[PDB]
Amino acid sequence: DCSPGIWQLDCTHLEGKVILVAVHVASGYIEAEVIPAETGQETAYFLLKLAGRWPVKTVHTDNGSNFTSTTVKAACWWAGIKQEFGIPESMNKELKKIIGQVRDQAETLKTAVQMAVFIHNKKRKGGGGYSAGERIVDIIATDIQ
Amino acid sequence: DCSPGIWQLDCTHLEGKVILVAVHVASGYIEAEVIPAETGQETAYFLLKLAGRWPVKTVHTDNGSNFTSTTVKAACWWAGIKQEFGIPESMNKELKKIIGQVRDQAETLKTAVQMAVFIHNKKRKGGGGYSAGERIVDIIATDIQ
Ligand SMILES: Cc1nc2ccccc2c(-c2ccc3c(c2)CCCO3)c1[C@H](OC(C)(C)C)C(=O)O
Ligand SMILES: Cc1nc2ccccc2c(-c2ccc3c(c2)CCCO3)c1[C@H](OC(C)(C)C)C(=O)O
Structure with missing residues (x-):
């Protein structure tokens, strides 16, 4: 029932680095990036x-x-x-x-993050049963038409 | 009529920097990033x-x-x-x-690139008449269901 234009954005910290995490609230879809500094x-x-x-x-x-x-x-x-x-x-x-x-499957944190994003967005959520990646695309497309 | 899983990826050069450009072929939707080096x-x-x-x-x-x-x-x-x-x-x-x-509306090339990506993906293409951003989401969603 959530509006399809609403996103949540935060930073977490891991291994002394900064991970910017954006969540599309309606779907659970995420986008993330390791950033060099927590700055504007x-x-x-x-x-x-x-x-x-x-x-x-x-x-x-x-x-x-x-x-x-x-x-x-x-x-x-x-x-x-x-x-x-x-x-x-x-x-x-x-x-x-x-x-x-x-984590141990990649050299760098940034690579592990993108692996984790992939896994999160692709996982079927039935525990009918789409992934976050499928839900975002459906939610937005339906909202167009 | 193009398959929805097909993407084109290249690099261009501008101002002595490197721009990685991915195109979703079926829709014209693009994603781009200025990268520090043209590397694997x-x-x-x-x-x-x-x-x-x-x-x-x-x-x-x-x-x-x-x-x-x-x-x-x-x-x-x-x-x-x-x-x-x-x-x-x-x-x-x-x-x-x-x-x-x-270009003159931003300090850095990377910022101008993202502005150009935004403009490209949002433009209504009727010259019915959706934007690349709308077309990708529709194409993928329809392909799910
Ligand atoms: C530094 C690095 N060196 C390599 C040398 C040889 C072969 C692979 C790599 C990979 C790599 C590439 C894709 C990938 C995974 C790891 C792990 C599984 C998902 O796919 C990385 C990774 O870094 C980059 C992706 C930036 C190249 C990494 O951090 O481990
Ligand atoms: C370096 C820089 N310094 C600033 C100082 C004060 C106010 C704004 C900026 C902007 C900026 C931010 C958003 C934006 C545009 C420009 C231009 C219009 C779109 O939105 C930038 C830009 O760089 C960052 C985005 C990395 C901060 C830029 O390259 O010009």
């Missing part, structure tokens, strides 16, 4: 990429100060994004769980 | 991200030697991707055109 510039750039791919209307975060930089506000201004305050989970544990499971 | 490791990593997001079955390129590294072959092995040889355009000019149009 990184968040702004990430939001521009996200918005060119999906119809992003509002973004929520669990750390509001993430969104106070002028650099982030410029990215939401240009892409027509607004901040979402009133949201009614949680993938940071679950994605961290998958990362832990595949 | 960058291509492999990019393919892992791409494959966690879309149902990527085959990838074609205009420079076959792009795909000879062990690092790329490991990424297509792990993600279940095969190379596509027999393909029946062109965005590298068109995307370059949009980049040129917005």
Whole structure:
């Protein structure tokens, strides 16, 4: 029943590095990237990429100060994004769980993260039974037509 | 009439930097990234991200030697991707055109690229009349069901 334009964006920390995690709330679909620094510039750039791919209307975060930089506000201004305050989970544990499971199968954390994203988005969820990757595409397509 | 799992991947050069460009052939939808070096490791990593997001079955390129590294072959092995040889355009000019149009509106090339990707994917194509972003989502969703 969730609006299809709503996304959640946070950062977690692992191995002294920073993982930016975006969740499409309606579907559970995720996108993630290991970023060199937890900064406004990184968040702004990430939001521009996200918005060119999906119809992003509002973004929520669990750390509001993430969104106070002028650099982030410029990215939401240009892409027509607004901040979402009133949201009614949680993938940071679950994605961290998958990362832990595949970690030794890759040299770098960034590679393991993308493996974990792949696994998460492709998993059939019947425990009828689509994956997050299938649900996002259906939700958006139905919302077009 | 194109298969929905087929993607084209190339690199272009601008301002002495490297832009990796992936095109979903059936829709015209694009994803791009400025990469620090034109290397197998960058291509492999990019393919892992791409494959966690879309149902990527085959990838074609205009420079076959792009795909000879062990690092790329490991990424297509792990993600279940095969190379596509027999393909029946062109965005590298068109995307370059949009980049040129917005270039002065951003400090960095990487930012301009993402602006150009956004513009390209959102543009209604009626010259009925959906955008590449709408077409990819419809094509994939219909292919699920
Ligand atoms: C550094 C590195 N070196 C290699 C040398 C030879 C062969 C493969 C690799 C891989 C690799 C590539 C795809 C892949 C996996 C690992 C693990 C399974 C999924 O696919 C990596 C990975 O890094 C890059 C992806 C950036 C190249 C890694 O971090 O381990
Ligand atoms: C370096 C940089 N510094 C800034 C300082 C203050 C305010 C904004 C910026 C922007 C910016 C952010 C979003 C955006 C656009 C530009 C241009 C329109 C689309 O949205 C950038 C851009 O770089 C980052 C996105 C990495 C921060 C840029 O290359 O110009």
